[PDB]
Amino acid sequence: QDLMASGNTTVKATFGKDSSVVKWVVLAEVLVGAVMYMMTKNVKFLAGFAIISVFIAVGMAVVGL
Amino acid sequence: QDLMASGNTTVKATFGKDSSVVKWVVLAEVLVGAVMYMMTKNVKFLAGFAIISVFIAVGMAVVGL
Amino acid sequence: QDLMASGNTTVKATFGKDSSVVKWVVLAEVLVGAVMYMMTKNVKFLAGFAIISVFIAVGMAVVGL
Amino acid sequence: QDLMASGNTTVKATFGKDSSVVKWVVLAEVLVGAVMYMMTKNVKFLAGFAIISVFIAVGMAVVGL
Amino acid sequence: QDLMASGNTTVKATFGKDSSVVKWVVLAEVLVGAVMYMMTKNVKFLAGFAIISVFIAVGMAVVGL
Amino acid sequence: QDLMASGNTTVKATFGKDSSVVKWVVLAEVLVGAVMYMMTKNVKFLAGFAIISVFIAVGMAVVGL
Amino acid sequence: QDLMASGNTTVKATFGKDSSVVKWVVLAEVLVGAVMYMMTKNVKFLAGFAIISVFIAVGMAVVGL
Amino acid sequence: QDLMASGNTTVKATFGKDSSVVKWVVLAEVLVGAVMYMMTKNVKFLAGFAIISVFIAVGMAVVGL
Amino acid sequence: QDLMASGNTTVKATFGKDSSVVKWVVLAEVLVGAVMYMMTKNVKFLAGFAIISVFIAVGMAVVGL
Amino acid sequence: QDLMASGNTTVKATFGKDSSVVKWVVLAEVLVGAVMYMMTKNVKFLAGFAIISVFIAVGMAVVGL
Amino acid sequence: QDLMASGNTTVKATFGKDSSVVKWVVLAEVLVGAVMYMMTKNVKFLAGFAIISVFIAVGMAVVGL
Amino acid sequence: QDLMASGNTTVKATFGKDSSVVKWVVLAEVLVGAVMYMMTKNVKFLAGFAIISVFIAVGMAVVGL
Amino acid sequence: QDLMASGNTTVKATFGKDSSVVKWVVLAEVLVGAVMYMMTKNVKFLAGFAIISVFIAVGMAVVGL
Amino acid sequence: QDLMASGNTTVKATFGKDSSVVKWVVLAEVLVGAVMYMMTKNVKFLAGFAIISVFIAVGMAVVGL
Amino acid sequence: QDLMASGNTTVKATFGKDSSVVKWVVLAEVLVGAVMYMMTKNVKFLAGFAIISVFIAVGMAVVGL
Amino acid sequence: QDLMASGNTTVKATFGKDSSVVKWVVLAEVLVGAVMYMMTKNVKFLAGFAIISVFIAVGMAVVGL
Amino acid sequence: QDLMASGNTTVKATFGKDSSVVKWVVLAEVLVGAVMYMMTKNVKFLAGFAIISVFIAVGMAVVGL
Amino acid sequence: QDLMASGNTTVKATFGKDSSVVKWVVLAEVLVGAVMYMMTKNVKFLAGFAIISVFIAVGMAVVGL
Amino acid sequence: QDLMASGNTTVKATFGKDSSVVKWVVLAEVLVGAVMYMMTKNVKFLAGFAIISVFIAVGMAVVGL
């Protein structure tokens, strides 16, 4: 029949590829990496900056409801 | 005779390989891992991202009602 | 529907390309590098000085809500 | 809205192009270089003496709140 | 009809975006983070300082009675 | 109506920008950093010395009851 | 009203610009630096010797209850 | 009131300008330098021999309880 | 009228600023810290040594019956 | 009246400036430091050797029943 | 009265200036230093060889029960 | 009484001036120095060859149980 | 009988010699090595570039489901 | 008689030398090592790659039901 | 089946032979080498300038998704 | 799709054939060479003076975004 | 009378200076040290190899029922 | 009586001077040293190659059940 | 009895005097040395080229299972 947890899925809107929360993540990510680099002065922290984004993309693309 | 817990199995629809709940899981999984990585900056948390999915797949394939 | 974490986004104002915090970062960055150079006397630490800025720019441009 | 870290920015006064701290830096810089030269007797250490200053200037000019 | 728990909602006044309690929270938050940093000397604890505030804001904005 | 946790706010006097406790913090902060430097002999620990102060200032300015 | 942590401030006497503890610090500082130099034979460790003192002075002057 | 770490200051006697420990330092200092010179045959190591002494003197004179 | 738990307050004598128990506390405190330092060899445990004392003082001064 | 935990204070005799236990502490302290130095070959561990002693002294002098 | 940890002090015999354990220490100390020198070929490790001994002596002389 | 670590001292036999281990040391010492000289062709490595031996001798003579 | 984890093995497709993930690896590998070389200017980092590939190949060939 | 846990031993099929799961292991093993090497650039992680395999082999050969 | 990390591969666009990032690399490479040469005045640093490019080319050609 | 690091490329403006930084380089290059020649009085240091320029040119021409 | 835990003391036979278990210990000890050295290539792990043995000996000699 | 851990001692066969495991050790030892030398090009790693063997021998000879 | 790690020893085949891996080693060894010589132009790196081989031989001959 109907799976009862169905419907809704503003969950998607909530978490969607376009969503506040998503944008939140990389934001602080951008920060801390930039932060960390001051401390470290190593080239490390600029990756998931891009990577998590596409990482986000793929899993979002993977699941995407 | 008839096992009385039988019938129904919208349970399947509820939990099925295609189900809200399933999609829910990996979603937050994608999140927390991405979250964790900001904190950790270790390559760890991108696995069950894929793995749990196929892990889901196999057990779902294992049982599948 | 409406993703509930939406609205607000003074978060943007908070973290925006024009924001206090952003300006904070490079500031101390300028410092420590200048600091470090006294110790090191190597040409190293003048990069993210510029780079993080454009690094900031791109990610800000990448996400930008 | 209002980014909450805003206001204040005696931070600027604290770190500004005219600030104690800034003047502190080059001071010791002048020292150690002069110090180092006694040891080294190489022409090295008189640079950021001027350079960091303009380096300070540019980043200060770069960010400048 | 009338939901009996209704009325009142000095609860709001009690817990509102403007309320003592709210202000209480971030206060001690400011403290402990500043406290922690002495111990840790890591850049960690200055976040919910801002973040919880907007976190407060959003949930307050989310529910807001 | 009246939020019951209201009134009082000697809490402010207790924790205010001018308060014992506040002054307590930076004090020990000054100490441990000076302490740490003996051990480390790195330029690290003189920051929140100033920074926490303005950090205190801003959050105090942020909330300030 | 009265902030309860107030009064006392033999804390000041305890930690004051004139205090045992303060004098303790630079003392061992003088030692270890002199110690270190034997090992290192680098001109490094004679700084906070003076610097921490004025560093002490400023923060003491900064807070000073 | 009375700073509790006060009194005592056999600490002074312990570490004083006249103290065993002080005399200990320069002693081994004299040694290692003389030692080092055998290896190095450079004129380096005869400095803090005198210098640390006056260095000791000044900091001792600086703090001197 | 008369609060029945009143009178007595040898409780004070029992717990007073001058009391056995009070003196007991810091004693073992002195011990364990000294103990701990052997294990740790970190400068940590000498604080409440002084601090708890004044901490004791203030709360004692705070309440003091 | 009489604070009941009073009397006794063989506790003092037990823990006193002259006591077995006290002497016990520095003993093992002397050991482990000497031990550690074999491993480390750093000049670190000879401090509380003297310091804890006077540290003991002061707190003992601080409290001293 | 009598401090209960008193008596015994075969502890002394155990750890005394003449004791097995004491002799144990310098022994391995002699070894590792001699060991280390093979690796290092630096004049470092022959010190506490003598020094710890007198270091032992003094602390033993310091405490000596 | 009796220090419990006493007795035994086949430890001596184990490590004694006449012991396998002792002889082991200088052996490899002889080797590596001879080895090193091939590489270096400097007169360096023939010292503790003799020196460690007498170094061994003295410390052995120093402690010698 | 049938091993239940069997079937599936899109795992292979997932991780196969031809797979996204595989290609991902060497990619970043190419990067970081090229990155590192800028810093190091040593010939080091161009190996697993080729090597991991054949390393991948062999293990893939080793297991290959 | 018959040990009741007997029979079955599709467990073997499940875990056998030829089994999905087994192949799973080394797979990710191949990955992480290759992964790690990018980070480390040390020759470490290519061992159990082969070794665990034969390690698997032996224990499998050891037990093998 | 379908390897879930598949699709996407704007990763390619991201990192492709034609990509911003790629161009970024050699750029700074050109810089630092030119920089280094001022310091060194050795012919060293003009290699990966060309070499990394073809190095990039080959690995890109090697993997190229 | 769109490579996310794209756009921006004021990076070019930043580092372009016409850019401050570029002009900076050769400047100091001109200096140090002229400097060096005083010391050396060898004809060496006038090369990258021209050469780096065309070296700059070619790599700039090579990459040029 | 008779202490009831008495008798038995095959415990001795179990744990005695000659016992399986004892021999077990040093065995694995020999292993891991030899193991560790491969990893470390430091001279560390060959000690309790001998030492624990005599350590065993002494405690065994100490207690020995 | 009989120490219960007795008997067995295929443990010996397991770990004996002639045992697989033993031979395993030196094997990888031979490898890594040879490996290391490529990296280091120092004469270091050929020792326990022989030494551990006799080290094995002696401890094996020491315990040998 | 039977040492359980026994049997197998395709380990030998794996690592044997004739084995892939062995041949792998010297190969890259040949490379890097030839590589290094370009950089160094010293006669150094052609040794273990031959030496490791016989070094391999001896240890292989030493252990050889």
Residue numbers in the entry:
A (entry chain 2E), B (entry chain 2F), C (entry chain 2D), D (entry chain 2C), E (entry chain 3F), F (entry chain 3E), ...: 6 to 70
Copied sentences from the primary study:
Conjugative pili are widespread bacterial appendages that play important roles in horizontal gene transfer, in spread of antibiotic resistance genes, and as sites of phage attachment. The pilus is a polymer of the VirB2 protein (or pilin). The structures of the pED208 and F pilus are very similar, with overall dimensions of 87 Å in diameter and an internal lumen of 28 Å in diameter. Thus, selective binding of PG to pilins occurs in both F and pED208 pili, and thus, the F family of pili are polymers of a selective and stoichiometric protein-PG complex unit.
During the process of helical reconstruction, as the resolution was increased, an additional separate density became clearly visible and readily interpretable as a phospholipid. For the F pilus, it became apparent during the process of helical reconstruction that two populations of filaments were present, differing slightly in the rise between subunits (see below). Instead, two 5.0 Å resolution electron density maps were generated for the two F pilus populations. For pED208, the angle between adjacent subunits is 28.2° and the rise is 12.1 Å, while for the two F pilus structures, the helical parameters were 27.9° with a rise of 13.2 Å and 28.1° with a rise of 12.5 Å, respectively. Superposition of the structures of pED208 and F TraA reveals very similar overall structures (root-mean-squared deviation in Cα positions between pED208 and F [13.2 Å rise] of 1.4 Å and between pED208 and F [12.5 Å rise] of 1.5 Å) with slightly different boundaries for secondary structures. Also, the TraA pilin structures in the two F pilus forms are virtually identical (root-mean-squared deviation in Cα positions of 0.7 Å). Thus, with the structures and helical parameters of the two F pilus forms being so similar, functional differences between them are unlikely to arise but cannot be excluded. The amino acid sequences of both the orthologous pED208 and F pilus TraA pilin are similar, except for the F pilin N terminus, which is 4 amino acids (aa) longer. This longer N terminus could not be traced in the F pilus density maps and thus must be disordered. Indeed, the presence of phospholipid in the F pilus was also confirmed by MS; however, this time a PG species, PG 33:1 (16:0, ΔC17:0), was the major phospholipid observed in the F pilus after PLA2 treatment.
